[PDB]
Amino acid sequence: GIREKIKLVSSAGTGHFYTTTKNKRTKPEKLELKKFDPVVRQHVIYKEAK
Amino acid sequence: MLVSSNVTMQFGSKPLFENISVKFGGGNRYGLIGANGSGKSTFMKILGGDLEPTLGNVSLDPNERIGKLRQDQFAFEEFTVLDTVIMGHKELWEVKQERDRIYALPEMSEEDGYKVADLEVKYGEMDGYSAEARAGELLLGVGIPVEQHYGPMSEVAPGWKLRVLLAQALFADPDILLLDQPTNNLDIDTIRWLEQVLNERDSTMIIISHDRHFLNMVCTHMADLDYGELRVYPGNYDEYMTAATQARERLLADNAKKKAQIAELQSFVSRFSANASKSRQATSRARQIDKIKLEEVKASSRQNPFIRFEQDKKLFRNALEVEGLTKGFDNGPLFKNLNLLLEVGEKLAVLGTNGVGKSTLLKTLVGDLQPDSGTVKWSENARIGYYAQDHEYEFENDLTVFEWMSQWKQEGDDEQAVRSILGRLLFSQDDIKKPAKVLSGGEKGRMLFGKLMMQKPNILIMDQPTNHLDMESIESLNMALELYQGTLIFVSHDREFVSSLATRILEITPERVIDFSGNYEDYLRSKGIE
Amino acid sequence: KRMRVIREKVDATKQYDINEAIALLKELATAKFVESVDVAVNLGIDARKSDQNVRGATVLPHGTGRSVRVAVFTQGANAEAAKAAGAELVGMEDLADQIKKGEMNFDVVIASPDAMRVVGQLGQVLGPRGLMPNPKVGTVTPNVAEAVKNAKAGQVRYRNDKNGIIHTTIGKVDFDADKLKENLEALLVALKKAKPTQAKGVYIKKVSISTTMGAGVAVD
RNA sequence: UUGAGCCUUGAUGUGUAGGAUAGGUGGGAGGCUUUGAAGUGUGGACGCCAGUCUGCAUGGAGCCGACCUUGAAAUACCACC
Ligand SMILES: Nc1ncnc2c1ncn2[C@@H]1O[C@H](COP(=O)(O)OP(=O)(O)OP(=O)(O)O)[C@@H](O)[C@H]1O
Ligand SMILES: Nc1ncnc2c1ncn2[C@@H]1O[C@H](COP(=O)(O)OP(=O)(O)OP(=O)(O)O)[C@@H](O)[C@H]1O
Ligand code: NA
Ligand code: NA
Hints:
The structure is cut from a larger assembly and holds chains A (50 residues), B (530 residues) and C (220 residues).
Chain A: E1 3-9, E2 17-23, E3 32-37, E4 42-47
Antiparallel strand pairs in A: 1-2, 3-4
Chain B: E1 3-5, E2 9-11, E3 14-17, E4 21-23, E5 30-33, H1 40-48, E6 57-59, E7 66-67, H2 81-84, H3 91-102, H4 112-115, H5 120-125, H6 132-142, H7 162-169, E8 176-177, H8 189-198, E9 206-207, H9 212-218, E10 221-224, E11 232-234, H10 237-271, H11 283-289, E12 318-328, E13 333-343, E14 347-349, H12 360-366, E15 375-378, E16 384-387, H13 401-405, H14 415-423, H15 441-455, E17 459-463, H16 472-480, E18 487-491, H17 496-501, E19 504-505, E20 508-509, E21 512-513, E22 516-517, H18 520-527
Parallel strand pairs in B: 5-9, 5-10, 7-8, 14-18, 16-17, 17-18
Antiparallel strand pairs in B: 1-4, 1-6, 2-3, 10-11, 12-13, 12-15, 19-22, 20-21
Chain C: H1 2-5, H2 18-28, E1 36-43, E2 56-59, H3 76-81, H4 93-97, H5 99-102, H6 123-126, H7 144-153, E3 155-158, E4 165-172, H8 177-194, E5 204-210, E6 216-218
Antiparallel strand pairs in C: 1-4, 1-5, 2-3, 5-6
The complex binds adenosine-5'-triphosphate (2 copies) and sodium ion (2 copies).
The structure holds one RNA strand of 81 nucleotides.
PDB class: ribosome
Keywords: abcf, initiation-complex, ATPase, ribosome
Entry title: E. coli initiation complex with EQ2-YbiT in Non-hydrolytic 2/PtIM(b) conformation
């Protein structure tokens, strides 16, 4: 509805992304969560893009 | 062709503009008009490449260069004028940064012999020899002294130092030019020069402005930033006006026709569709209303601020009396022994034309002490409202917008009043949570009116009250300030405002001070200039 | 005048032969002079990009027919080796700054990677005429003695105009035809080798050979 | 009648500071003008209006580079644009 989809692209250099939904009215800035990257097998930072 | 794809910038809660995808360039000049709070400057610094957009991308050929006019004055105060006007061509300036840095340490070893020896060929092929004297007779075209433009950037008086930044924009022979608010708070003759020079070179300038004249002189296409989209109308300012008006009016007429033939159809559907033996005669129309489907209409971003100034406690007889007026800083006394008296209800139009004390007299009157004038005096119950041309200092603070407005809620005004005084100014609770120092020039100016409302002052002072403001927020002032019963002293640099608002005229000539009663029309007839 | 009567003597649209064109040049040369003849080739490139520029230097097989008083800007061992190289300059900090302060210029600039006096002493004059040494042009080289041959043997330099046309002297009108032929051919071949990578289209769009005062014609 | 493009030909592209409306190269530095001049007899076009371009010639056989202040040099002249 109002909460639409974004993807958290990996900042470990590879092509990997988790998918989540974010309320774009209240939060206008990106998401920054440390999430597991299985290609490199370590916890890197995961910025959002689309 | 510099191209942009699906930018969709979101600032706080609502996108100023979404999924814009458009090509630019080709050697044309594009205006960038829009409503005062429409994020056009944000789009401009997205296009240049300063800040990354929320979505999408902007691609320009790496060799082709951009030249953007930045407002960061005295960001170059450390070094001199003739190189700060050159450093706007970044590719040839790092050349000097390396040439004058490698040399110093002794000596030119066998890595110097090939890192700096063929560094000067960069100088040659970027035309570094003809750098100052090609920028010299550009700073002179602007008017930054004539031969004195040198020494520390603090040497040039901060009154008009930003003309160096303006001349920095087009020195580099740039293909892309992105001058942003080029001639705000500026004079007329140098504007004439800029209008004539901009279209001499063959570039692809994107120009953002609000005056009709500049856009018509130096434009070939126009872009809007209305309804969250930029659609390019070829032509001029008047051409855009007529095109936009005609298209919106035809849309609001197509809407009327669709509404009429939908309402008539729905009448039949409501009459039928429940009849026991004629029910199936509404279903050839129930499916036809499903095929008219009037197109989405989006609220126009123009709007009108309901500005209304109201006095608190009115006064009588003399508003002020000033005698002794004499003050000068470097050149000498700008005005010597100026005597004037203002009855209540008077309106003054004290215009100066770029550096005659046109603002420092107002600063003295509101209070900026140590003049030779010992007989400046206000009325007794006087309450003063001040609009200085520098809105930066009042917003050098991390206060949110609403709480910043809440510095002066008078005894009787609540959250409801302090927030309705900005809701009246079409500011949204959407934007009520943002820090103060992030608003545009026109938005800051209108917030200053939202502060002038609170104090309910019987004296108003305005120093170029209209700057970076669009047409509508100047029309609201023209139709609201004229219905103000208290004293008014202002200086509008433009012409129509003073000709339609003035009651008395008082200008500081570079050697003396004039005075005249009667509006700017009668003053123009007295002068002899039409 | 002469140029209202030879305008009909020379045709512009017609492309002449290599030998016939130089014969026409020799038959059009009238004014008393050595009349160093030149050639301008329209290289097909865009000057708006630095990567496509053609800055070069090559030695002609016959020579230009004139000598240049190249100044050796060196010091130390480098400035001492050039003394016996048959040059016309001395490399030192004083002889560069003060000596060249009033002096106009030399034909070429000696390579001075050993000293530290011939770096920026040129200033407005040493760079406005393009007299600074460069690595691509070979002016700034470590072998001063070897570069003496290029300085004295006719190390012709060439740089693009802001459009993309390279013109340089190919000899004098006193030179013979079978010598001017190979002289032009050597420079043309050097340009072909020096051609950059991303030079789209055909690079040699015209070869206009001419004299100082005569006419200018195409050859191919 | 006129648009679009190309070859050719010819004009125009000054502040300062300098003789003076110097486009970049760079060939050269002594060449242009008397199968009829610098200046004079005289129109129009352009123009930041100070000045350039232009029928011929009674008279005509003499003007421009070196110096110079400039980032750079000069219709001394041609070239490719
Ligand atoms: N940090 C921020 N957070 C939220 N919104 C912001 C921020 N900075 C700017 N904005 C918004 O972005 C828009 C900026 O508009 P813009 O600067 O283009 O205005 P303008 O007056 O037309 O331009 P200008 O006066 O700069 O020429 C406004 O809606 C403003 O509220
Ligand atoms: N503190 C100061 N120090 C030095 N010079 C100053 C100072 N204040 C003003 N001046 C100079 O004195 C003159 C007064 O200019 P002023 O500040 O009145 O601006 P204005 O161009 O007349 O108007 P406005 O500020 O309204 O745009 C200007 O030449 C300015 O440079
Ligand atoms: Na802005
Ligand atoms: Na000002």
